[PDB]
Amino acid sequence: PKIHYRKDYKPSGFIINQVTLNINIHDQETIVRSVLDMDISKHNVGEDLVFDGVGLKINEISINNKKLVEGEEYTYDNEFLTIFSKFVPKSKFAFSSEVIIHPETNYALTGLYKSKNIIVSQCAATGFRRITFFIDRPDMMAKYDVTVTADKEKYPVLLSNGDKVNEFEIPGGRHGARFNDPPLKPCYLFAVVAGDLKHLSATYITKYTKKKVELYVFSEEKYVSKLQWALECLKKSMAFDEDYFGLEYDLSRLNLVAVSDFNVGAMENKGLNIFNANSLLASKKNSIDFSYARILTVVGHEYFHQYTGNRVTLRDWFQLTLKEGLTVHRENLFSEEMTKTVTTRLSHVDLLRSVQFLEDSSPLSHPIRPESYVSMENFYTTTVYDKGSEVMRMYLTILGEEYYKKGFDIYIKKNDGNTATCEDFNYAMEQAYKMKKADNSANLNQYLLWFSQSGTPHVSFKYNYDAEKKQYSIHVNQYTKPDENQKEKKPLFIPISVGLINPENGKEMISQTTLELTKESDTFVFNNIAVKPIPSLFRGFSAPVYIEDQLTDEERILLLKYDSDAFVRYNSCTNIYMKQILMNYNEFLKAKNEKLESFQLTPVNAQFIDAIKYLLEDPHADAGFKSYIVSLPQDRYIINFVSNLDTDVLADTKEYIYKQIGDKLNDVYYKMFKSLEAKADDLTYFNDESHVDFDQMNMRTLRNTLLSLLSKAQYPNILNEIIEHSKSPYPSNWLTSLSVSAYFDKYFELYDKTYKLSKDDELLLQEWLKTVSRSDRKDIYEILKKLENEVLKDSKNPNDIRAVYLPFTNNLRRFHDISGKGYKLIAEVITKTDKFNPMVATQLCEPFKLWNKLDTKRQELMLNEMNTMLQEPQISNNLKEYLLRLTNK
C-alpha cells in the first residue's frame, strides 16, 4: 500500500500538451483510442515514462506511430504502464493507445460507467486513469479534442467539454460528435455523457459583458419535469457570483446532468456539471422539503467551481481543501443569501459540530490539508470540506466584506493561469490583511496552522466586572488536545465575534467587535460598560471550536430570549441542554452501576422551560429556530462530551429530558401544531415549481417536529392528527406521518399507504426507505429484513443502499443493541458493498467512527466487526486504509 506524502511533491518529468480522444461505445464494450502529444520537461532526469492506467485492456500502444512490444519495451500491471526510458524519446513525441473498457459492469461508479440508460464519466482524481492512460495528476494541464460515437437510438444525446464542432452519421445506426476544448485543463475536469436525455433550457445574459449563455439541465425522460428548480437555482447562482464576487460565466454554454447512480452529490467538470439525481431533481408532489435546499446548495456549489476552476487549478490533491473548502464557503454565502433564514447557517454549524467534531476527535482525525494519503477518495471528508469552509469563512470574518473581496481578487489575479496551494490563498488574504491593518508588517503566518493542525480547539472564558470603574474583562483561553498528528499543539489565530448584552433590557452595549485571539490566552478589557453585561460569544459561530462560555443557565436563558445573534441563542440553548444531559446521564449511570433500587434525577430547569414556552408562543419568532430549541442536541454532538458512552443510558437520559419538557409544554405544542397548519401547508403554489418558500418549509419542519414530540409523548388522540397528516399533499408531511405512527397500531397501515405513494418515483421511494429505516420501531430488524427482501434486493444503487441502512444506524437503542446485532448487520453490508463499490463501502463505515467512545462492551463488539471486515481477503484498498486508520492499527 503506497503512501503519498505532501512534502514529497515534485513536478513531472513529462508534459502532456494535447489529448485527442476517440470513445467508441458499443453494446458490451467501449473502445477508447487516445493520442497524447507529449514533451520532455525541464525536471526530467531520464526516468521511465509511467502512465496511470487502471483496469485497462490493451489492444496496442505506440510511440510515434510505432507499436510497442510487451515485456521488452513496456510493462503493464493493470495499474501502471511503464515504458523503459531507452524507448522514450528525448524530445517532443506522440504516445498513442487503444484500450477496451466496460462501463456496463463498472459498478464502482468511477471512470466511465453506465447508470441505468446513461453513460457518464466521473474522473475527480484517480478516475480518468480508468478511461485511458494518463499522468493522472491535477498539475498536468492539457488541451482536449474528444470524439464520442455510439448507437443513435440508445444514445441520441452526446456531451463533453468545449464546443461541439462536428456531428456525423456512422454505418450501423451509429452517430458521432466531436468536442474541442482549447483551454488547458486538468484531466479531473474532463467529462463525457451519452444517453437518451431530455432537457429544460434557458438563456442567461451576463451582467457586464452582456454575453448570452445557454443553460441546459438534463435527465432521463421520465423525470424531465423535475428539472425546473435546478434551472432556477442555476440562474440564482450565476447572478450571485456576479453580484457578490463580480464574476461572470466564461463560456457560452453550461450543462447540468442528473444520473441515478452516483457516489457523492455532484462533480464540477468544465462547462458540464454532473449530479446525483437526488441533488438535481425535485417536484412538490414527489420530493420532501429538504430536496429544495439541497439542490440549491449543490447546483450553487458546482457553479462556483467554474470561475476559479477556469483560472486556478490544484497543484496536487493535498490542496483539495483550497478548492472544496473555498467553494463550500461560497456555497454557504449563497444559500444564506437565497434562503434568508437563520436556520441555514444554524444547519451548517449543527452538521460541523456533530459529524466533523466527531471525526476530528476520532482516530481518523486529520488537518484540512493532510500530510499523506493512500486512497485519495478517502479524503473527501467533512474535515476537508466543512472545516475547510469554516477556515475559509474566518478570512471573511477577520477582514470584513470589503477587504475579503480585495483579497479574493488578488488571489485570482496573482495565480491566474497556474496551479495553486493553500499557501497561495493565505498570501493573498495576508495582502488584504496588511491593507486593512494599515500596516505592511502585519502577517497571517500563524493562520497557516488552520491548514496543518488537526483537532478541534477548546475555547474557554472567565469574566470580571468592576461596577465602579464601569470596566468589563473577558479572559480567554485556547487549547487543542494533542493527538497522533501533532505532539505539541500551537495557539491558533482565533477570531471571536462578540457582543455585550445588557441583561436589564436586552440591548447591545457595544458595536460589532471581533476579538483576535492569537495567544494561548488573553484578557480583553472594555471601558464605559455601564452595567454588568452578559457576553454574546462567537457570534455566527465565528471559529470552528469547542465553546465553553462558563455562563450560568440564568445568563444563557437571557441570551436565548434576548440576544440578537441566532447562533449564540441556539448555542446557549444547546449549552443548557448539555449541562442537563451530562447531569442526568451521570445520575442514570451511577444508579445502574450501583444497582440502586431507588434514586433521584435532577429535573429540567423550570425557567428554561418557561423560556422555550415564551419563544414558541411568540408570533414574530422564526419557525425554524423554534424547531431547534425544542430538540435536544444531536447524539453525535453529545458523545464528544462523554467518555465510555453507554448508549442505553443516553437514550434513557434523552427520554427523561423530553418527558420533563413535554409534561409542561405538550398543550402548547398541540396548539401550535394546529395553528401553523394553514400557513405551513398552503397549496397556492403547489404546482409552481419555481416558487420556493423557505419560511413555509420551516413551518412544516416545526409542525413535523411538534407532531413527533406529541406522538412520542402519547398525547391524547394524537393518532387522529397523524392519520389526517398522512393525507397531506406534501411528502414532508405524509412521510412524517409514517415515522411518528411507529408508536401506534396504524404503522404498517401507513407503511403500505406511503409505499404506494412512493413506489413510482425513484427518488421518492428512496426517501420512503429512509423514513422506514429511521422509524422508531421495536421490530426494526424484521422491518429491515422486509426492505431487503421486498424493495432493496441486490440493488447496486448507492442511493438505495444508503437509504436503507444509514438512518437505522442513528437508532440509539436499536443499532447499538448490546448483542452487537446492529454492528454485525452493517459490517455485512459494508463487506458486501466493498465487492463492487469501495467508496460507498467506506461511507457505510460511518457508524464505527465513534467506536472508541462507547462503553467497554460496545467498543469490543464494534472492534470485532471491524477486524472481521479487515480480515476479508478481497477487501479493497479504500476500505483497508480506512479501517486501518480507524482502528489505529
Q: Which residues are catalytic?
A: 302
| CB-nearer residue toward Zn ion: 22 or 327 | 327
Binding partner selected for residue 236 from Zn ion, Mg ion, none, CB under the kind-specific 5 to 8 Å limit: none
Q: Which of 315, 323, 329, 816 binds Mg ion (CB under 5 A)?
A: 323
CA distance 102 to 29: 5
- Residue 325 is a binding residue for Mg ion (CB under 5 A): no
Directed axis angle between helix 320-339 and helix 422-437, to 10°? 60
Q: Which stretch binds Zn ion (CB under 5 A): 3-11, 113-121, 316-324, 615-623?
A: 316-324
Please report whether residue 305 would count as binding Mg ion according to CB under 5 A.
Answer: yes
Sign of the CA dihedral with 639 first, then 644, 648, and 652 last: negative
The cell numbers describing 796, all together, are 447496486
In whole angstroms, how close is the CB of 274 to Mg ion at the nearest point?
16
List the single partner that 291 binds among Mg ion, Zn ion, none, CB under 5 to 8 Å by kind. Mg ion
DSSP string, 752-807: HHHHHHHTTSHHHHHHHHHHHHH---TTHHHHHHHHIIIIITT---HHHHHHHHTG
Euclidean distance between CA atoms 804 and 789, whole angstroms: 12
CB of 314 to Mg ion, least distance (A): 8
String marking each residue 270-309 x if it binds Zn ion according to CB under 5 A: ----------------------------------------
Site residues (CB under 5 A) for Mg ion, limited to 64-93? none
* Cα(841)–Cα(433) distance, integer angstroms: 44
The residue (of 275 and 694) whose beta carbon lies closer to Zn ion is: 275
**Residue 237 binding: pick among Zn ion, Mg ion, none (C-beta 5-8 Å cut-off by kind):** none
Residue 4 Cβ vs Mg ion, minimum distance, rounded to whole Å? 22
Binding status of residue 291 toward Mg ion by CB under 5 A: yes
- Residue 309 as a binder of Mg ion (CB under 5 A): the answer is yes
Question: Quick check: 584 binds Mg ion (CB under 5 A)?
Answer: no
* C-alpha cell belonging to residue 503: 441583561
Element (H, E) at 827: helix 821-834
Q: Which residue has the cell 522514450?
A: 88
Closer to Mg ion by Cβ: residue 305 or 393: 305
3-state secondary structure of 465: strand
Question: Rule CB under 5 A: is residue 278 a binding residue for Mg ion?
Answer: yes
Instruction: Select the span of 80-88, 323-331, 555-563, 685-693 touching Zn ion (CB under 5 A).
Output: 323-331
Residues 6+ apart with CB under 8 A from 314: 138, 139, 186, 320, 322, 323, 419, 420
The binding track of 324-353 with respect to Zn ion, each residue x by CB under 5 A or -, is x--x--------------------------
> Which CB sits closer to Mg ion, 4 or 285?
285
Pick between residue 266 and residue 710 the one whose CB is nearest to Zn ion.
266
Of 324 and 587, nearer to Zn ion (C-beta) is 324
Which range of residues in 317-325, 520-528, 536-544, 735-743 is near Zn ion by CB under 5 A?
317-325
How many CB atoms are closer than 10 A to CB 119?
A: 24
What is the DSSP secondary structure assignment for residue 808, as one 8-state letter? G
111 binding Mg ion? (CB under 5 A):
no
Helix boundaries (H) for 246-271: none
Per DSSP, which regions of 434-510 are E strands? Answer: 458-466, 471-479, 494-501
Nearer to Mg ion, 323 or 700 (CB): 323
Span of 62-70, 300-308, 409-417, 687-695 interacting with Mg ion by CB under 5 A: 300-308
By C-alpha distance, which of 618, 633, 734 is closest to 668? 618
Q: DSSP alpha helices (H): ranges in 384-466?
A: 388-415, 422-437, 449-452
Strand runs (DSSP E) across 292-444, as ranges? Answer: 312-314, 372-373, 418-420
Q: How far apart are the first and last CA of the chain?
A: 14
Q: Does the protein bind Mg ion through residue 265 (CB under 5 A)?
A: no
| CB contact at 8 A, 74 and 105 | no
Place of cell 469547542: 546
Q: Which of 327, 307, 542, 322 is nearest to 425 (CA)?
A: 322
Cβ neighbours around 804 below 10 Å, total: 21
Q: Which stretch binds Zn ion (CB under 5 A): 105-113, 319-327, 343-351, 723-731?
A: 319-327
Q: Which residue is nearest to Mg ion (CB)?
A: 55
Q: Strand pairing partners for 95?
A: 36, 63
Q: What's the rounded Cα separation, in Å, for the pair 100 and 610?
A: 69
Q: Give the distance from CA 687 to its chain's centroid.
A: 30
Interface segment toward Mg ion; rule CB under 5 A; list 321-329, 439-447, 634-642, 701-709 = 321-329
Cβ(291)–Cβ(350) under 8 Å?
Answer: no
Separation CA 663–CA 416 (nearest Å)? 62
Q: Spell out, one character per residue from 711 to 750, where the chain touches Mg ion: x when CB under 5 A holds, - when not.
A: ----------------------------------------
Size of the site for Mg ion (CB under 5 A): 9
The CB-of-245 to Mg ion minimum distance in angstroms stands at: 12
Question: What are the φ/ψ torsions at residue 129 (nearest 5 degrees)?
Answer: -70, -10
Q: Report if residue 763 touches Mg ion, rule: CB under 5 A.
A: yes
Q: Which of residues 498-527 bind Mg ion (CB under 5 A)?
A: none
Q: How many CB atoms lie within 10 A of CB 760?
A: 10
Stretch of 28-36, 274-282, 321-329, 840-848 contacting Zn ion, by CB under 5 A: 321-329
CB of 299 to Zn ion, least distance (A): 12
Work out whether 54 is an interface residue with Mg ion (CB under 5 A): no
CB of 331 to Zn ion, least distance (A): 8
By CB under 5 A, tell whether 263 contacts Mg ion.
no
241 close to 204: Cβ distance less than 8 angstroms: no
Q: Is residue 284 close enough to count as binding Mg ion by CB under 5 A?
A: no
Length of the chain: 889
How far is 497 from 514, CA to CA, in rounded Å? 4
Supply the minimum distance, in Å, between the C-beta of residue 15 and Mg ion.
Answer: 23
- Tell me which of Zn ion, Mg ion, none is bound by residue 308, counting a contact when its beta carbon lies within the kind-specific cut-off of 5 to 8 angstroms: Mg ion
* 574 Cβ contact partners less than 8 Å away, ≥ 6 residues apart: 633, 637
For residues 305 and 348, which CB has a smaller minimum distance to Mg ion in the complex? 305
User: Is residue 55 part of the contact set for Mg ion (CB under 5 A)?
Assistant: yes
215 binds Mg ion (CB under 5 A): no
Q: Is 308 in the site for Mg ion (CB under 5 A)?
A: yes
User: Distances from the Cα of 440 to the Cαs of 406, 407, 430, 599, 657, in angstroms?
Assistant: 16, 15, 10, 65, 55
Residue 764 CB, nearest approach to Zn ion (Å): 26
Binding positions for Zn ion, 553-582, rule CB under 5 A: none
Sequence letter at residue 757: L
Query: Do 257 and 199 contact (CB within 8 A), yes or no?
Result: no
Nearby residues of 42 by Cβ (< 8 Å), 6 or more positions away: none
Of the pair 327, 339, the CB lying nearest Zn ion is at 327
For 825-863, b/e burial (b = at least 16 CB within 10 A) is: bbbebbbebbeebbbbbbbbbbbbbbbbbbbeebbebbb
Binding range to Mg ion, per CB under 5 A, among 9-17, 297-305, 376-384, 687-695: 297-305
Binding range to Mg ion, per CB under 5 A, among 289-297, 496-504, 517-525, 772-780: 289-297
* 261 vs 324 by CB, closer to Zn ion: 324
Selection from Mg ion, Zn ion, none that 278 binds (CB < 5 to 8 A by kind) is Mg ion
Q: Nearest approach, Cβ of 314 to Zn ion (angstroms)?
A: 11
Q: How far apart are CB 856 and Zn ion at their closest, in Å?
A: 40
Tell me if 764 sits within 8 A of 287, measured CB to CB. Answer: yes
Give min distance, CB of 824 to Zn ion, in A.
35
Nearest approach, Cβ of 644 to Zn ion (angstroms)?
38
Q: Which is nearer to Zn ion, 327 or 758 (CB)?
A: 327
- Contact residues: Zn ion, CB under 5 A: 324, 327
- Contact residues: Mg ion, CB under 5 A: 55, 278, 287, 291, 305, 308-309, 323, 763
